[PDB]
Amino acid sequence: LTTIWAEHLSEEARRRFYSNWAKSKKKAFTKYAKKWQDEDGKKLIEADFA
Amino acid sequence: GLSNRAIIIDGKNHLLGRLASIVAKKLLQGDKVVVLRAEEIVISGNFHRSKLKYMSFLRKRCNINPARGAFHYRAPGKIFWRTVRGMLPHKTNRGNEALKNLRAYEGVPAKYQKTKSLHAPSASRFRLQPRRKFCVVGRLSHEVGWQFQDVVAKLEAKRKVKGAAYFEQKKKMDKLAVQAKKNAAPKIAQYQKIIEALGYN
Amino acid sequence: RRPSAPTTGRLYVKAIFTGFKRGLRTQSEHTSLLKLEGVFNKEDAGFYAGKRVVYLYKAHNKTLKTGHTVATRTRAIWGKITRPHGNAGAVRAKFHHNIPPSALGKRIRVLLYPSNI
Amino acid sequence: VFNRVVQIGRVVFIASGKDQGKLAAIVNVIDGNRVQIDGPSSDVTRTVRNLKDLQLTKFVLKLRVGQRTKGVKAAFDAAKVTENFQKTQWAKKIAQRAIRAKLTDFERYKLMKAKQMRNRIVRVELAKLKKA
Amino acid sequence: KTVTLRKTLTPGTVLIVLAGRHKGKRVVFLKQLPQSGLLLVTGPHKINGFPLRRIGQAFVIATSLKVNVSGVKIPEHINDEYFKRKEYTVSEQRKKDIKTVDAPILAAIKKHPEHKFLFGYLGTRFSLGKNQYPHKMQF
RNA sequence: UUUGCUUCCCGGUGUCGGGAGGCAUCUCUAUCUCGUGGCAACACGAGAGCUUAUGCCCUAUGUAUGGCCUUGGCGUCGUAGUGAUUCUGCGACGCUUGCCAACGCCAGAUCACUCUGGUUCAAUGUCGGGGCGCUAAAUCACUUGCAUACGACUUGG
RNA sequence: GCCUAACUUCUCGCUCAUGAGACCCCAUAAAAGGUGUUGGUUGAUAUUGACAGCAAUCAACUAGCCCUGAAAAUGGAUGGCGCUUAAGCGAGAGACCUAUACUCC
RNA sequence: UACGCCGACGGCGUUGGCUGCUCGUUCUAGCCCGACAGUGUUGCGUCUUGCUGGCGGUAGUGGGUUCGUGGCGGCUAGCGUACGUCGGUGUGAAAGUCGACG
């Protein structure tokens, strides 16, 4: 139905989304992390928890 | 004779083969058909007859490679779909294009949860003599391998509760509308005369 | 400005080309079979005997027929209902050219003329 | 559970077949399927009909087994079966359908206009009631 | 020889046009033209914009409604030659003939107690609605 | 994807097909509906071919002026609810929408029908202008050995 | 009934089979059985109250449907799907479909 | 205007298909009347009212069945042209439109 990720994800956890992590810009979850410290993002996260 | 929309048919209290033949004729003639509550369709004869027939059907598998053999679908919707398929020239382009216009479901999906369904009186089980046993495709599917009987039952119960609430509200509003017409009588008396004279009330 | 009593609805009866005259292993494409909307007897089907019918289809090349203002992709095949077929209200029809089999289940317009009411 | 029964004197309404839309009186029962009925005052001859074509009404006449046409007619006009049947919604619906089937194009236009005006007014009153 | 007129077709009857740009219009029938045999009809051009022209009886439904047409006096120059086909443009002559023929018809419609419904009927176009099967409809 | 690009709107332009609108309880079939009394079972009273989907809505000239009635539809936005993801209710704001004087008055015509609803509707592709808006990855080659005939698989920069 | 052009058309019966039956040649079935059900034949008892327990009954037969008799090897065949007041079995009725056959052109 | 290439609506010829009325013809009643016999019988017993059966009548009334070297209609099809009424297109190219093949 939905998935909620932690605000801070370990670098080794984010590596799993990559095949060339070192060569990439490491942008995974960068925008999602900002939702937790945002008014609308917090509302969406709370709605997902509900 | 084509219908503009798809034909939504409530599968409850319908005879499997008769409904399948009617739906196959419609599909061949060019309409789209949606069948709801496929688990509520019935087959005449005691349960043991249908159960043993389905077991014999299950026994039909390719000796060399069962992944090639007959595919025995257990869900009521797929059972009805295959029964209709049997009544079509599905090995030809005509039959394939006709069969691809059929959708059979267990329960009422949210898409159709808010529409009026039809019945085929010529396929109702109440044409059987009262002293004649009949099985339910839901029970047959459960006993031959269907894994979602309870889930569909719970969802259908919730749907029925919501529909009952909606119908109570609708009854209230219909009483209100009758009262409103009664009140409007003085203004509409001029037109009600014409309506009744032409026989419409 | 509104054209002072414009069109309000269809002026034809809906029908579907259900197939050609046939046995089981034979087929005569010179005659077509149509199923009409609201017709359920040969008695009712006989009312439409002699009425013209049309099949409209879409083609690639656009044509600007005289009497039209815009080039159109739609062409027509004309025909006429000849007699009822069977007991359940189907009709037999004959078209200027044999109906293409691609018209199976597609709309056929049964016009109300030549009128005799 | 069953109130109306196939009994001598029961008034039946011919639902389908030869004399469709008329009333007759049961004067005999031949077997479980065939019943001899005679509607002399409703323009129905003494005949045998399948029960599959008949529908039971609420009127029962005080007849005798195999009552002749004279007696059944006397009972029919005595009981006034036709007036009472015409009083019922059963007959009102039939008369309404008969009027409906014979409407002309002009009458259809008039009906459409009057019906839409009535519907508009009734909707206004329904809105009034809903606001309260 | 001339074509035989359908029995239901008499002067003043309202017909439904079945073909052409005016299909579905309710017009009023004046008389059968002698030469061609077509129908000189004119739904009063004021109401439904149907001018004074001809139409074959094969493309009309003769309804039971009949408007009083005894008062209209058709000019003698209106005939098959008058209507014979020559960018068309309506002529100031055609305008005068339309008004001359239509005026008594409009007066007769007005005097009818049902003039409201009559004007509305002539101004509305016929169509097939839901569950409306021509073989069961009494026109 | 620092040029490229998502999304929305405006315009071209290709390709493609369809061919007259809308409608929500269930359960039950050797009983059902309404009203009342009942926790419930049930009871009383009045009805019941049942053809209310064989139905019901909708169903068309344009100002103006005067008299009515203010309802219904559509779009955006905001909250509240609905999980079998869309759909609902409530507003608020916009664009409209009914009848009478009254066919009172203007306009309407293409010659008799041949694909126009007399520009029918949908789906998508691409090219140009704008409005917010974003600034990535695989892959080869090396490497790893839990893997491997070759591809493939598991690692790192 | 749908494959499949032509009726879920009309009338009366019979049949429930834990895979019934379903149309010349034709694509297997018998002897013998059933207190399943439906009709008939014969002989008795019974209202001077017939059988069971402290108002019809009894007995022997007969023939329709159904059941037992009825076991083979790749998974499979009334042609298939399916069909149970049938879409089965028997007697029938209207209409309808369809040949390179018949009539006419 | 005529003519060519195509369509529509009428007329006529031919072969039809479906569907009604109306006269009669054959064999026959029932309703109606009379006596007798019976009884699935209402109301209060060689009662009565019903009802049935043949039998005898048929004046009047009067339906079934059968078809005719009968009479009068309604809708509509294919083919051909006693033939009419008319539309599309074609008369320098070209484009479009129309026609035929495909």
Contacts of B31 (CB under 8 A, 6+ apart): B2, B3, B6, B7, B101
Residue position matching structure tokens 């996260």? A45
C109: closest chain B residue by CA: B1
Closest by CA position to B139, among listed B61, B58, B79, B71: B79
* Record: contact E127-C5, CB cut-off 8 A: no
Torsional sign, CA C44, C50, C52, C54: positive
Closest by CA position to D26, among listed D58, D82, D65, D53: D65
From the alpha carbon of A30, which nucleotide's C1' atom is closest?
F136
Residue B179 token pair: 């009262």
Residue B138 token pair: 């839901």
Amino acid letter, residue D91: A
Residue position matching structure tokens 């839409």? D116
- Subunits next to E (3 or more Cβ pairs <8 Å) are C, D
Residues of D in contact with B177 (CB under 8 A): 122, 126
Q: Which member of B184, B198, B201 has the closest CB to residue D122?
A: B184
Beta bridge partners of B124: B14
- Interface check for B178 against chain D (CB to CB < 8 A): the answer is no
C89: closest chain E residue by CA: E135
* Record: contact B2-C105, CB cut-off 8 A: yes
Q: Contact, B140 vs B54, CB < 8 A?
A: yes
Q: Contact, B46 vs B135, CB < 8 A?
A: yes
Could you give the dihedral angle defined by the CA atoms of residues D53, D57, D62 and D63, in that order, rounded to the nearest 10 degrees? -10
Q: Give the integer Cα–Cα distance in Å for D49 and D17.
A: 9
Experimental resolution (Å): 2.6
- Interface check for D30 against chain B (CB to CB < 8 A): the answer is no
Breaks (C-N over 2.5 A) in chain C follow: none
Contacts of B63 (CB under 8 A, 6+ apart): none
Task: Say which DSSP state E3 is in.
Answer: P
Contacts of D28 (CB under 8 A, 6+ apart): D8, D35, D36, D65, D66
Torsional sign, CA D41, D44, D48, D49: negative
Contacts of D69 (CB under 8 A, 6+ apart): D38, D40, D46
From the alpha carbon of D30, which nucleotide's C1' atom is closest?
H40
Q: Give D112→chain B minimum CA distance, Å.
A: 9
DSSP readout, D58-109? EEE----TT--HHHHHHHHHHHTHHHHHHHSHHHHHHHHHHHHHT--HHHHH
Torsional sign, CA C84, C86, C89, C91: negative
Q: Give the integer Cα–Cα distance in Å for C94 and C29.
A: 9
Closest by CA position to C81, among listed C113, C103, C43: C113
Q: Give the integer Cα–Cα distance in Å for B129 and B45.
A: 11
Beta bridge partners of C92: C33, C83
Q: Contact, E126 vs E81, CB < 8 A?
A: no
B74: exposed, middle or buried (Cβ count in 10 Å: 0-12, 13-18, 19+): middle
| Buried-exposed string D88-126: b where 16+ CB fall within 10 A, e elsewhere | eeebeeeebeeeeeebebbbbbbbebbbebbeebbeebb
| Buried-exposed string E40-66: b where 16+ CB fall within 10 A, e elsewhere | bbbbbbbbbebbbbbbebbbbbbbebe
Beta bridge partners of B136: B42
Beta bridge partners of D37: D26, D47
- Name the CA radius of gyration of chain D, rounded: 21
Residues of D in contact with B191 (CB under 8 A): 114-115, 117-118, 121
Largest CA distance in chain E: 46
Q: How far is CA E6 from the centre of its chain?
A: 15
Q: Contact, C40 vs C80, CB < 8 A?
A: no
Beta bridge partners of D50: D34
Q: Which secondary-structure segment (H or E) carries D13?
A: strand D10-14
Beta bridge partners of C85: C90
Q: How far is CA E104 from the centre of its chain?
A: 14
Closest by CA position to D110, among listed B196, E122, B195, E62: B195
Residue E79 token pair: 């005939």
Amino acid letter, residue D54: L
Amino acid letter, residue B121: P
Q: Give the integer Cα–Cα distance in Å for E59 and E62.
A: 10
Residue D25 CA to H80 C1' — how many Å?
61
- Subunits next to C (3 or more Cβ pairs <8 Å) are B, E
Q: Give the integer Cα–Cα distance in Å for D122 and D110.
A: 18
SS3 category, E15:
strand
